[PDB]
Amino acid sequence: MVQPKSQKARLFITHLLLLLFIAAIMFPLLMVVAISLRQGNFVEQADGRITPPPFPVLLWLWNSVKVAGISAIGIVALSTTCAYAFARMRFPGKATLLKGMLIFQMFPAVLSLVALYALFDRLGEYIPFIGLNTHGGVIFAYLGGIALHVWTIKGYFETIDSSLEEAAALDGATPWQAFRLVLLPLSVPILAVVFILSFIAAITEVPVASLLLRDVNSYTLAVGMQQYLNPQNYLWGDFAAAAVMSALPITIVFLLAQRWLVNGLTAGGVKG
């Protein structure tokens, strides 16, 4: 039997340890106590009464989820293409580009805010990636410049055996057809993982607040909670309600991508 003896012991120890870890890392995330101090906060973000900032469920949550989904889809596509190229074909300057892109990946916002604000207010002319408050030009599909995911799909591509796409190429498939019909279906868990990471990064993105010109109506829920955080009152009992609301889309996206994740994809493929 593959199942080992004394499994109940290891299973029980693992369950107890995981439960204790869950409690320890959930206690600081018990943010709902400040909300449920008064039930009027859920004031009344979900429905009813009047709240000076607009009802997050229909506006801020929707904007955040739309931006996150679009950015994640574009990021996944671009990163998977770049990683396939880098990992499994040759072109001059490849190594130099990898080392460069790694170095230029890392940067703080102390330069980002001024440089990107200059970029946006210099853009000015008419293109769909409108620099100023757009909700469709900034952030939206414009978070696309990513290095971690390019590296991640590349490294995953290095794991998969090459002989599969070698046989595909020997069958007359162009590299595009091979990449579409062999490499991606066996590499789909990494696309799921990177999609998850991109969605969470886009959802919880407080910096790059280029939507400040139009700061009441539709814009990102992160900047919305930042507006909730006001110096002269430090009002939090309703501010954290938007955070607990934004806890939901990540859970839903994680479950949807969980339906994708699977092991043993390259099972029984090649010998040796």
Partner 1 sequence: SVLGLLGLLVGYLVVLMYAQGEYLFAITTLILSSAGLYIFANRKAYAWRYVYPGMAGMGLFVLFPLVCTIAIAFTNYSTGWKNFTRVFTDEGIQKPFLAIFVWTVVFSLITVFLTVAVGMVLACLVQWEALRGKAVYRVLLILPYAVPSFISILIFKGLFNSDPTTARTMLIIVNTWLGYPYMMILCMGLLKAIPDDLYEASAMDGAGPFQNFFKITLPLLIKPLTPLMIASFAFNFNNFVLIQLLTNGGPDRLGTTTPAGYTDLLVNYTYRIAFEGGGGQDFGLAAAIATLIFLLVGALAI
Partner 2 sequence: ASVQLQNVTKAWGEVVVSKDINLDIHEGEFVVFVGPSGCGKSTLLRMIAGLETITSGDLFIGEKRMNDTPPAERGVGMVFQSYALYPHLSVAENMSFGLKLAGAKKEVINQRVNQVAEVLQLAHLLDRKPKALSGGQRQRVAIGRTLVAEPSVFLLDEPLSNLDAALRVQMRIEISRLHKRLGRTMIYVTHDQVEAMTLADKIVVLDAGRVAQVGKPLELYHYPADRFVAGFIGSPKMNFLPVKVTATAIDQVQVELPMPNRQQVWLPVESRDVQVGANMSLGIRPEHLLPSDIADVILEGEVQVVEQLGNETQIHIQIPSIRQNLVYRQNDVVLVEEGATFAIGLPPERCHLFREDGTACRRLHKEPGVA
User: At its nearest, how many Å lie between partner 2 and the CB of residue 161?
Assistant: 8
239 binds, among partner 1, partner 2, none (CB under 5 to 8 A by kind): partner 1
CA distance 20 to 150: 36
89 sits near partner 2 (criterion: CB under 8 A): no
User: Considering only 47-55, 110-118, 131-139, 162-170, which stretch makes contact with partner 1 by CB under 8 A?
Assistant: 110-118
Q: Which is nearer to partner 1, 50 or 251 (CB)?
A: 251
CB-nearer residue toward partner 2: 114 or 181 = 181
Size of residue set near partner 2 by CB under 8 A: 31
Binding of partner 1 by 181 (CB under 8 A): no
Show contacts with partner 1 in window 213-252 (CB under 8 A): 222, 225-226, 229, 236, 239-240, 243-244, 246-247, 250-251
Q: Which stretch binds partner 2 (CB under 8 A): 8-16, 44-52, 115-123, 163-171?
A: 163-171
Our CB check for partner 1 shows the closer of 135 and 156 to be 156
User: In the complex, what is the shortest distance from the CB of residue 197 to partner 1, in angstroms, rounded to a whole number?
Assistant: 6
Segment 30 to 69, residues that bind partner 1, using CB under 8 A: 30-31, 34
- CA 182/CA 266 separation, integer angstroms: 11
Residue 7 and residue 206 in contact, taking contact as beta carbons nearer than 8 Å: no
If one asks whether residue 3 binds partner 2 (CB under 8 A), the answer comes out as yes
Q: Which residues between 227 and 266 bind partner 2 (CB under 8 A)?
A: 264-266
Question: Could you give the C-alpha distances from 43 to 38, 227, 232, 238, in angstroms and in order?
Answer: 10, 15, 18, 7
Report, in Å, the least distance between residue 163 CB and partner 2.
4
| Of 43 and 240, CB closest to partner 1 | 240
Window 169-208: residues binding partner 2 (CB under 8 A): 169-174, 177, 181-182, 185-186
DSSP string for residues in the chain: --SPTTHHHHHHHHHHHHHHHHHHHHSTT-THHHHTTSTT----SSSSS--SS--TTTTHHHHHHHHHHHHHHHHHHHHHHHHHHHHH---TTHHHHHHHHHHHH---HHHHHHHHHHHHHHH-S--SS-SSS-SSSSSTTTTT--SHHHHHHHHHHHHS-SHHHHHHHHTT--HHHHIIIIIHHHHHHHHHHHHHHHHHHHHS--S--TTTTS-SSS--HHHHHHHHS-TTT---TTHHHHHHHHHHHHHHHHHHHHTT--S-TTSSS---
Contacted by 67, from partner 2, partner 1, none: CB < 5 to 8 Å by type? none
**Number of chain positions touching partner 1 (CB under 8 A):** 103
Which parts of this chain interact with partner 2 (CB under 8 A)?
1-5, 161, 163-164, 166-174, 177, 181-182, 185-186, 264-272
